[PDB]
Amino acid sequence: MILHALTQYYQRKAESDGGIAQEGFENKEIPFIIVIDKQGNFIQLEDTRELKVKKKVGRTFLVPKGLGRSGSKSYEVSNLLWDHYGYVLAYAGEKGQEQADKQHASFTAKVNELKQA
DNA sequence: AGGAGGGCGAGGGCGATGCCACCTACGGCAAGCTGACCCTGAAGTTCATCTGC
Protein backbone atom coordinates (compact mmCIF):
# COMPACT_ATOMS: atom_id res chain seq x y z
CA MET A 1 0.00 0.00 0.00
CA ILE A 2 3.05 2.22 0.22
CA LEU A 3 3.37 2.07 -3.56
CA HIS A 4 -0.01 0.95 -4.75
CA ALA A 5 -1.09 4.20 -3.15
CA LEU A 6 1.52 5.92 -5.31
CA THR A 7 0.67 3.99 -8.45
CA GLN A 8 -2.94 4.80 -7.62
CA TYR A 9 -2.49 8.42 -7.83
CA TYR A 10 -0.18 8.44 -10.79
CA GLN A 11 -3.17 6.83 -12.45
CA ARG A 12 -5.23 9.67 -10.93
CA LYS A 13 -3.00 12.64 -11.75
CA ALA A 14 -2.31 11.21 -15.19
CA GLU A 15 -6.10 11.17 -15.54
CA SER A 16 -6.83 14.43 -13.73
CA ASP A 17 -4.80 16.16 -16.46
CA GLY A 18 -2.46 17.34 -13.73
CA GLY A 19 0.51 16.95 -16.05
CA ILE A 20 2.50 14.00 -14.77
CA ALA A 21 5.13 12.26 -16.88
CA GLN A 22 3.33 9.89 -19.21
CA GLU A 23 4.53 6.28 -19.22
CA GLY A 24 8.03 6.92 -20.53
CA PHE A 25 9.15 10.28 -19.28
CA GLU A 26 10.21 12.39 -16.33
CA ASN A 27 9.81 16.00 -15.25
CA LYS A 28 13.57 16.43 -15.28
CA GLU A 29 14.94 19.74 -14.05
CA ILE A 30 16.85 20.68 -17.21
CA PRO A 31 18.77 23.87 -16.38
CA PHE A 32 20.57 24.85 -19.59
CA ILE A 33 18.43 23.79 -22.55
CA ILE A 34 20.34 23.92 -25.85
CA VAL A 35 18.98 25.58 -28.99
CA ILE A 36 19.97 24.32 -32.44
CA ASP A 37 18.73 24.94 -35.95
CA LYS A 38 17.16 22.37 -38.27
CA GLN A 39 20.59 21.03 -39.33
CA GLY A 40 22.82 21.39 -36.27
CA ASN A 41 24.38 24.82 -35.84
CA PHE A 42 24.05 25.56 -32.14
CA ILE A 43 21.87 28.62 -31.76
CA GLN A 44 21.62 29.44 -28.06
CA LEU A 45 22.27 27.90 -24.66
CA GLU A 46 19.16 29.08 -22.85
CA ASP A 47 18.95 28.56 -19.10
CA THR A 48 15.49 27.69 -17.84
CA ARG A 49 16.48 28.51 -14.25
CA GLU A 50 15.44 31.24 -11.77
CA LEU A 51 13.26 29.77 -9.03
CA LYS A 52 13.47 29.67 -5.21
CA VAL A 53 16.49 31.39 -3.63
CA LYS A 54 18.78 28.46 -4.42
CA LYS A 55 18.47 28.63 -8.17
CA LYS A 56 16.99 25.21 -8.82
CA VAL A 57 18.39 23.97 -12.03
CA GLY A 58 15.84 24.41 -14.75
CA ARG A 59 12.23 24.47 -15.76
CA THR A 60 10.99 20.92 -15.36
CA PHE A 61 10.86 19.70 -18.94
CA LEU A 62 8.98 16.43 -19.18
CA VAL A 63 11.73 14.63 -21.08
CA PRO A 64 12.54 10.92 -21.64
CA LYS A 65 13.18 9.24 -18.33
CA GLY A 66 16.57 9.27 -16.66
CA LEU A 67 18.05 5.84 -17.25
CA GLY A 68 19.84 5.50 -13.91
CA ARG A 69 23.39 5.39 -15.20
CA SER A 70 25.08 4.57 -11.90
CA GLY A 71 28.13 2.52 -12.74
CA SER A 72 31.80 2.33 -13.57
CA LYS A 73 30.95 2.12 -17.27
CA SER A 74 28.28 4.76 -16.70
CA TYR A 75 29.08 6.39 -20.03
CA GLU A 76 27.24 3.76 -22.06
CA VAL A 77 23.81 4.55 -20.65
CA SER A 78 23.34 7.96 -22.28
CA ASN A 79 19.85 9.40 -21.67
CA LEU A 80 17.93 9.88 -24.90
CA LEU A 81 18.12 13.53 -25.94
CA TRP A 82 18.79 15.29 -22.64
CA ASP A 83 21.64 14.21 -20.53
CA HIS A 84 24.47 16.20 -19.15
CA TYR A 85 27.11 18.79 -19.91
CA GLY A 86 29.37 15.75 -19.99
CA TYR A 87 27.05 13.81 -22.26
CA VAL A 88 26.01 16.62 -24.58
CA LEU A 89 29.29 18.47 -25.07
CA ALA A 90 31.83 15.88 -23.89
CA TYR A 91 32.77 18.65 -21.45
CA ALA A 92 33.88 17.26 -18.09
CA GLY A 93 33.70 19.82 -15.31
CA GLU A 94 35.42 17.49 -12.86
CA LYS A 95 35.05 13.99 -14.35
CA GLY A 96 37.85 14.28 -16.91
CA GLN A 97 37.71 13.28 -20.55
CA GLU A 98 37.20 9.66 -21.64
CA GLN A 99 34.71 9.70 -18.81
CA ALA A 100 32.88 12.52 -20.56
CA ASP A 101 33.89 11.81 -24.15
CA LYS A 102 32.89 8.16 -23.79
CA GLN A 103 29.65 9.57 -22.41
CA HIS A 104 29.47 11.73 -25.52
CA ALA A 105 30.56 8.74 -27.59
CA SER A 106 27.38 7.04 -26.33
CA PHE A 107 25.05 10.03 -26.10
CA THR A 108 25.84 10.73 -29.75
CA ALA A 109 25.38 7.01 -30.32
CA LYS A 110 22.01 7.18 -28.55
CA VAL A 111 20.86 10.15 -30.62
CA ASN A 112 22.04 8.59 -33.87
CA GLU A 113 20.49 5.17 -33.23
CA LEU A 114 17.35 7.16 -32.53
CA LYS A 115 17.82 9.07 -35.79
CA GLN A 116 18.16 5.87 -37.81
CA ALA A 117 15.04 4.60 -36.03
C1' DA B 1 -2.52 30.13 136.47
C1' DG B 2 -5.83 31.20 132.10
C1' DG B 3 -6.64 34.40 129.61
C1' DA B 4 -7.98 35.95 124.18
C1' DG B 5 -4.25 37.16 119.54
C1' DG B 6 -9.26 38.72 114.68
C1' DG B 7 -13.87 38.83 113.02
C1' DC B 8 -15.07 40.75 107.78
C1' DG B 9 -14.88 42.25 103.37
C1' DA B 10 -13.83 44.52 100.18
C1' DG B 11 -8.57 43.95 96.87
C1' DG B 12 -10.92 47.13 90.90
C1' DG B 13 -14.02 50.15 88.39
C1' DC B 14 -13.20 51.89 82.86
C1' DG B 15 -11.77 52.98 78.71
C1' DA B 16 -7.95 53.09 75.72
C1' DT B 17 -3.00 48.75 73.63
C1' DG B 18 -3.42 52.80 68.63
C1' DC B 19 -3.44 56.54 64.70
C1' DC B 20 -0.89 57.41 59.77
C1' DA B 21 1.80 56.54 55.62
C1' DC B 22 5.47 53.86 53.51
C1' DC B 23 7.21 48.02 52.36
C1' DT B 24 9.92 50.45 47.63
C1' DA B 25 13.17 52.84 43.89
C1' DC B 26 16.31 51.28 39.29
C1' DG B 27 18.52 48.31 35.78
C1' DG B 28 20.61 44.31 34.18
C1' DC B 29 19.02 37.71 33.71
C1' DA B 30 22.99 38.05 29.49
C1' DA B 31 27.59 37.54 26.24
C1' DG B 32 29.51 33.82 22.55
C1' DC B 33 30.97 30.01 20.61
C1' DT B 34 29.18 25.29 19.13
C1' DG B 35 24.17 22.18 17.87
C1' DA B 36 28.56 18.42 15.57
C1' DC B 37 32.18 15.36 13.28
C1' DC B 38 33.06 10.30 10.20
C1' DC B 39 30.68 6.55 7.58
C1' DT B 40 26.73 3.77 5.92
C1' DG B 41 24.33 4.32 -1.24
C1' DA B 42 22.38 2.47 -5.76
C1' DA B 43 24.44 0.31 -9.43
C1' DG B 44 27.59 -1.14 -11.84
C1' DT B 45 32.06 -2.90 -13.01
C1' DT B 46 36.54 -4.37 -11.84
C1' DC B 47 39.57 -7.26 -9.90
C1' DA B 48 41.35 -10.63 -7.23
C1' DT B 49 40.50 -14.84 -6.42
C1' DC B 50 38.57 -20.22 -7.36
C1' DT B 51 37.04 -23.99 -9.45
C1' DG B 52 37.21 -26.72 -12.77
C1' DC B 53 39.38 -28.02 -17.00
Cα gap A61→A82, rounded to integer Å? 10
Burial class (CB within 10 angstroms; exposed 0-12, middle 13-18, buried 19+) of A115: exposed
Q: Resolution reached, in Å?
A: 3.0
Give, in Å, how far the C1' of B31 lies from the CA of A93.
46
Task: Give the residue from A105, A104, A103, A89 showing the smallest Cα distance to A36.
Answer: A89
Give the integer Cα–Cα distance in Å for A2 and A12.
Answer: 16
Q: Strand B closer than 7 Å to the CB of A67?
A: no
Instruction: Say how far apart CA A78 and CA A65 lie, in whole Å.
Output: 11
Q: Any idea which nucleotide's C1' is nearest the CA of A77? A: B44
Q: Check whether residue A68 has its CB closer than 7 Å to nucleic acid strand B.
A: yes
